[PDB]
From Swiss-Prot, chains A, B:
This is 3C-like proteinase nsp5. It is found in: Host cytoplasm; Host Golgi apparatus; Host nucleus. Changing residue 142 to A: Does not affect ability to cleave and inactivate human TRMT1. 3CL-PRO exists as monomer and homodimer. Only the homodimer shows catalytic activity. Interacts with host FBXO22; this interaction promotes the proteasomal degradation of nsp5. It catalyses: TSAVLQ-|-SGFRK-NH2 and SGVTFQ-|-GKFKK the two peptides corresponding to the two self-cleavage sites of the SARS 3C-like proteinase are the two most reactive peptide substrates. The enzyme exhibits a strong preference for substrates containing Gln at P1 position and Leu at P2 position. It comes from Severe acute respiratory syndrome coronavirus 2 (2019-nCoV). The chain holds residues 3264 to 3567 of 7096 of the full protein. The active site is at residues 41, 145. Residues 1-304 are cytoplasmic. It comes from the Viruses. The lineage of its organism: Viruses, Riboviria, Orthornavirae, Pisuviricota, Pisoniviricetes. Residues 1-304 form the Peptidase C30 domain. Changing residue 90 to R: In strain: Beta/B.1.351. Cleaves the C-terminus of replicase polyprotein at 11 sites. Recognizes substrates containing the core sequence [ILMVF]-Q-|-[SGACN]. Cleaves and inactivates human TRMT1, preventing tRNA guanine(26)-dimethylation of tRNAs. May cleave human NLRP1 in lung epithelial cells, thereby activating the NLRP1 inflammasome pathway. May cleave human GSDMD, triggering alternative GSDME-mediated epithelial cell death upon activation of the NLRP1 inflammasome, which may enhance the release interleukins 1B, 6, 16 and 18. Also able to bind an ADP-ribose-1''-phosphate (ADRP).
Length: 304, 304
């Protein structure tokens, strides 16, 4: 029993973190096989970030300008290239701690763990979600760029995020491991505003199923709804429209608890319309949306 | 910017997790040097847990009855002993992945990370706190016993908790690594009820300082209070009495933000008396108490 915001064990990713310095800028790199991946803005000064021409700035850099250090040991850079917004630094040594891995580009609504690092050293791990506006709400200070987001399936790490910037509103933006930003964000210090931070409806429903499994059931009611009626309420409250695909994804949780998906939607509709009246669900006073249906099944069954 | 519930990187602890089986019971063990630590209730059946005589049950066990497996490799047990509620299984091989470590017994109010495991395999990591009633609010299913709680200071892991049981109310109880339970709990399936789950006042204040540092300041007001006046309100709301020691511990956060501790107490007093009026602080709709002042400084400064 119990339900917590859980991150994946970070060991496999800790073994991949290195420090990358170019000139006066130091950030984190990810060392997989004989390649180190890092944000291309490691080649920028704070001044360059205002309007950087990355191809032009990169012409002034040679392999020996990229200082890569794994713990106390220096890595030899034998090649460098820019792929979208990431630099790939080829080193002469394969990381002996390279886990089985994949690079995946996640969809909004999906969760992942972040290993926040500074100077190539891990500081902490936390679980977050790709928001529908393509930002993440992380905890990143100066020096955290290059920290990565990932999911694990038994022994394979799927890297999905690399941290690049903080918007003036305190939210975070980054790329996948191919260097493509999530959403419309760019690696330039400009007016970049985030869109509506809508609530991930399917994740809130999954978390309500987790609450029922773990004993919190006060919000269950005598009502039902339809997908279209629920979506009229979802629109009003800036929740993502629920689709038949979301209903199908919630099938296993519905089967386990015996609560039909649309009945849980009616519970959620009442919670949106009436609030929680000073009560809590799984220790929260708001509707939590950063647990996917897969996260709920995984945590409730103890997948290793 | 940003403030998240962050756990320590779990790699150093992942390298210590093993599976321990005795008869039909399988749980987790912690392998440090040539000793494996695990809950003594690994020697019990579900029936034995009702009224176990551990010394008597242990007489029927020999070294070869304790099956210890680290990944796919079996460990040879050359001795066993019971220390309070933990068993220490001496093995013939020192764990090559033994980090620098200490065993510490934490005080209520202190936080730690838990690496939840099943069959000696890590499933997830999350941050929690020793509650004032000596329970923890974790996420533990059957098979999670022997999962540990820890803190890290640079390269030294301080182990503080080992999971042993779940009370009928869904909260968790366990021991330090010397086998002494936190609080009055016992390793017997009996009516064990938890006391009042009071709120850790000093941690709520530290989290309000984190909120100010990270931009959330709507709750700051024109008022001040005294330790005695604040404590009249703390008593009414089941909050721990604030002491001069707590005020002194908050000194660095007070110096950083320029907000006197007693002024923050007056903000907290207003929040307790009037609620949050549908507003949030650091993405929470309730007053968070599982970040210590040290956690706030650590996260806000990026300690690795």
């Amino acid at each position: 029993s119990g339900f917590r915001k859980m991150a994946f064990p970070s060991g496999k990713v800790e073994g991949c973190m290195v420090q990358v310095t170019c000139g006066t800028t130091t950030l984190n790199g990810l060392w997989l096989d004989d390649v180190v991946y890092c944000p291309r803005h490691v080649i920028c000064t704070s001044e360059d970030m205002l309007n950087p021409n990355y191809e032009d700035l990169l012409i002034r850099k040679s392999n020996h300008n990229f200082l890569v250090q794994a713990g106390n040991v220096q890595l030899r850079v034998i090649g460098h290239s820019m792929q979208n917004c990431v630099l790939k630094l080829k080193v002469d040594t394969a990381n002996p701690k390279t886990p089985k891995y994949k690079f995946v580009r996640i969809q909004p609504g999906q969760t992942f763990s972040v290993l926040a690092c500074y100077n190539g050293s891990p500081s902490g791990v936390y679980q977050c979600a790709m928001r529908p506006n393509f930002t993440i709400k992380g905890s990143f200070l100066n020096g955290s760029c290059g920290s990565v987001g990932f999911n694990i399936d038994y022994d394979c790490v799927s890297f999905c995020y690399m941290h690049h910037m903080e918007l003036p509103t305190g939210v975070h933006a980054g790329t996948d491991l191919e260097g493509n930003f999530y959403g419309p964000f760019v690696d330039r210090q400009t007016a970049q505003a985030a869109g509506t931070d809508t609530t991930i409806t399917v994740n809130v429903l999954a978390w309500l199923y987790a609450a029922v499994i773990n004993g919190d059931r006060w919000f269950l009611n005598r009502f039902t709804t339809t997908l279209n009626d629920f979506n009229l309420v979802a629109m009003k409250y800036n929740y993502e429209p629920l689709t038949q695909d979301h209903v199908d994804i919630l099938g296993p949780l519905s089967a386990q608890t015996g609560i039909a998906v649309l009945d849980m939607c009616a519970s959620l509709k009442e919670l949106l319309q009436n609030g929680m009246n000073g009560r809590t669900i799984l220790g929260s006073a708001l509707l939590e949306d950063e647990f996917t249906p897969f996260d709920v099944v995984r945590q409730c069954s103890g997948v290793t």
